[PDB]
Design a protein around this ligand. Sequence first.
Ligand code: CL
Ligand code: CL
Ligand code: CL
Ligand code: NA
Length: 129
Amino acid sequence: KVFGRCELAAAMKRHGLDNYRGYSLGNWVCAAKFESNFNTQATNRNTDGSTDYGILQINSRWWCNDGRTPGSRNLCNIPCSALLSSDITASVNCAKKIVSDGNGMNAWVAWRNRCKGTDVQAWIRGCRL
Ligand SMILES: [Cl-]
Ligand SMILES: [Cl-]
Ligand SMILES: [Cl-]
Ligand code: NA
């Protein structure tokens, strides 16, 4: 599924991401935009052989099992394919563990490089929330 901007904001808000660990909703929508272009089916293979999955491009090196990432962990205790559903629950819940692990949203490279220090509130502007 390819989400609309405000559609994703609303879904994220319902699942409790607005101000989660101090990151306003705008940050999460911005991260999703640049990580996946709002596409729940996005995948990208990294040079080390791991793969990034879903709307938030969560990495198989640590967070999910895809069966082809030797030496990896599955810290969200899910198959990576569950991160590709049109239902974003699994992605959001896993994202909550990631952002809690000490590095905050800097764990998403696209957030650090393209959202951090910008007017992130712009990404939820116009939305009925
Ligand atoms: Cl915001
Ligand atoms: Cl694996
Ligand atoms: Cl933080
Ligand atoms: Na893994």
